[PDB]
Design a protein around this nucleic acid. Structure first.
Lengths: 49, 56
DNA sequence: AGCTCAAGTACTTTCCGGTCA
RNA sequence: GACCAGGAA
DNA sequence: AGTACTTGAGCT
């Protein structure tokens, strides 16, 4: 069925940005602990909390 | 406070030495120590103390 | 010499490349 | 691991 | 980043 509205529609230059989710996503439940503080380590990379 | 803090105790004659877990040697590989900043400062204190002790 | 101040001080967010024993 | 530096909702 | 207190030193 037709849309009751008309759409603004056309080309528009879009850019792919360096922030991608599978590089961001992170989860931890028990894992490497700092030595001094014995708390979880920092950073996705290091598998932190 | 006559029990928990007398003024005389604001002055140090006996220096409590914290144990490794406070100043742990972060030891990369095996043939390379990597001691903690405090372990050094104590080392200095120790040394400085021995110079004074023998000096007098 | 002391005593007043202006001019001096340190101190007040969650993520993700280099040099140092 | 300290430390410095740079860049993000 | 502007205000805090507190230190500091210089002048009459």
């Amino acid at each position: 069925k037709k849309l009751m509205a008309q759409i603004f529609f056309g080309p528009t230059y879009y850019q792919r940005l360096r922030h991608m989710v599978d590089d961001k996503i992170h989860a931890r439940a028990r894992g490497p602990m700092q030595v001094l503080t014995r708390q979880p380590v920092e950073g996705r990379s290091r598998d932190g909390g | 406070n006559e029990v928990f803090s007398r003024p005389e105790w604001m002055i140090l004659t006996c220096l409590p030495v914290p144990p490794p877990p406070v100043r742990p040697s972060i030891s990369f590989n095996e043939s390379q120590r990597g001691e903690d900043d405090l372990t050094f400062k104590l080392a200095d204190i120790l040394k400085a103390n021995i110079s004074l002790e023998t000096l007098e």
